Design a protein around this ligand. Structure first.
Ligand SMILES: Nc1ncnc2c1ncn2[C@@H]1O[C@H](COP(=O)(O)OP(=O)(O)OP(=O)(O)O)[C@@H](O)[C@H]1O
Ligand SMILES: Nc1ncnc2c1ncn2[C@@H]1O[C@H](COP(=O)(O)OP(=O)(O)OP(=O)(O)O)[C@@H](O)[C@H]1O
Ligand SMILES: [Mg+2]
Ligand SMILES: [Mg+2]
Ligand SMILES: [Mg+2]
Ligand SMILES: [Mg+2]
Lengths: 277, 277
């Protein structure tokens, strides 16, 4: 077995090493928690880590991996994890994840072609493939995903249900700046004027959530009005759906999702909506 | 937890029941073995069961399931398993396996379009989807497949490697009638003259295996000659490949695969070949 030093950060890049260490740790009764990331860590990611660490005795495994895009489509990350009490960082190369190339893959259901999948019809196949691999390597009791990527979260629940995966999927609420802006690595691409304008997405959604006492159309129209008031924001979609991303029912709980471009940067956000309250 | 009676046959149809029972049993140190089948059991299947039972202390789980075919594409089974000392039979309905329909699925690599996949280009996606689900439900230490379906075996090894599955894949040699005919549920469709003619497939392959001291072309030509001598046998393919079903190399180990029709029944068989011996 690879060396593992409890109560310290241990970094592995070979899938077999993490699989061996995780197996040994689980046999001692320590539950294993998995937090998938693409690195470039910020407080939103740290919320997922802290949620994992709340589970007593947990070994928190944070993976850092950027999946290659399919056809036609020095940092302080480890220091941050060390300071959070993370004991395993898994940092595989593309070659380690795909030693035989892109061969067997996961084909998501039709939700993957909607919303974020409109612009990127192969994106969620890639996400679900990588998540499935991470789940099998680490064999966590629970895996943590942010509500900010709500469609991703829903698709991961579909993956887990459809393939009978013995893992609990935990959605963690979106961590926001003081003005409401959803934290995201991509926010670093925004210049100061764009960062100021970007508050429109959260302002729109929160407006809608409160407008919703007057019904679904009022909610949608309120959000659209806020977005239309922000000149440098080009909306890609603004959609109200049920909580599983099916059609919104006449009365009940739903989710309002928005994606918009500010210059070259595409931002996304979403919020709970209640109708027929 | 559902009741489990050790040392007796226990039958479950709900995935959750088997998952709960398997988990509990594994915690006691009993290793769990999985033998996937479509029922209609015969001595070929029993070879896989007996291979699983050789592992001391094993809980052998035999699943019986016929997967629905994708678009455009009273028995004594349980008594037989009971007599073999199988403790778990898993007999799910289609609805239990696919409660949300065919949604997330496995997309095999390009080998799935070759050989058996020529006639049935969606067949192995179905096989790999069902096997992945069974593996996740049961979480066996080892899973057993027959060499008779050699391409299936190779694709299952690809599934396990590509998705980082923590299971050992065990291939069990083909069980044959006294004359050589590979046992198969479909043999029951053969009339007596067809059953007699069907010996040609194994005769061809065994001839080839011995001809192979004189090289690959001699092996192929010997097999073709045997098949051409059997009038009621219509060959679909006869292919020599490396052991991973890539191109046969100039000197080394390979596999010769045949598929042929006798009336309305398609039979398959394959054998190890050594060249450059
Ligand atoms: N503000 C946030 N609140 C809660 N979870 C978040 C937040 N930002 C990211 N996450 C979650 O962290 C996980 C890793 O996401 P990822 O590494 O893509 O970070 P990201 O901030 O979304 O980066 P990018 O902007 O490049 O897409 C995902 O589950 C994501 O939903
Ligand atoms: N003669 C045999 N020897 C070894 N393994 C076998 C034999 N026949 C079937 N198996 C294995 O049993 C498992 C279940 O196969 P399945 O239930 O399809 O039976 P089958 O005999 O191949 O039926 P069918 O003829 O309808 O395809 C597979 O792993 C298969 O390779
Ligand atoms: Mg950093
Ligand atoms: Mg992201
Ligand atoms: Mg029977
Ligand atoms: Mg078969």
């Amino acid at each position: 077995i690879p060396a593992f030093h409890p109560g310290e950060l241990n970094v592995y890049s070979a899938p077999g090493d993490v699989a061996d260490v995780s197996r040994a740790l689980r046999l001692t009764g320590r539950r294993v928690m998995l937090v998938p990331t693409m690195g470039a860590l910020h407080e939103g990611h740290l919320a997922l880590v802290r949620a994992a660490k709340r589970v007593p005795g947990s070994v928190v495994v944070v993976s850092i991996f950027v999946n290659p895009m399919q056809f036609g489509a020095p940092d302080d990350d480890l220091a941050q994890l060390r300071a959070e009490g993370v004991e395993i960082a898994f940092t595989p190369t593309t070659a380690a994840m795909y030693p035989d190339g892109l061969r067997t893959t996961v084909q998501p259901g039709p939700l993957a072609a909607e919303l974020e999948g409109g612009p990127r019809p192969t994106h969620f196949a890639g996400v679900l493939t990588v998540v499935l691999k991470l789940l099998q390597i680490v064999r966590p009791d629970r895996v943590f995903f942010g509500e900010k990527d709500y469609q991703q979260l829903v698709l991961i629940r579909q993956l887990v249900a459809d393939f009978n995966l013995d893992v609990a999927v935990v959605g963690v609420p979106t961590v926001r700046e003081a003005d409401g802006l959803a934290m995201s690595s991509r926010n670093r691409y925004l210049d100061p004027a764009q960062r100021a304008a970007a508050v429109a997405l959260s302002a729109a959604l929160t407006a809608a959530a409160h407008a919703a006492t007057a019904g679904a159309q009022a909610a949608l129209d309120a959000a659209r009005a806020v977005l239309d008031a922000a000149p440098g924001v080009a909306v890609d979609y603004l959609e109200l759906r049920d909580i599983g991303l099916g059609p919104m029912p006449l009365n009940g709980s739903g989710r309002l999702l928005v994606a918009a471009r500010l210059g070259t940067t595409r931002l996304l956000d979403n919020i709970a909506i209640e109708i027929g309250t």
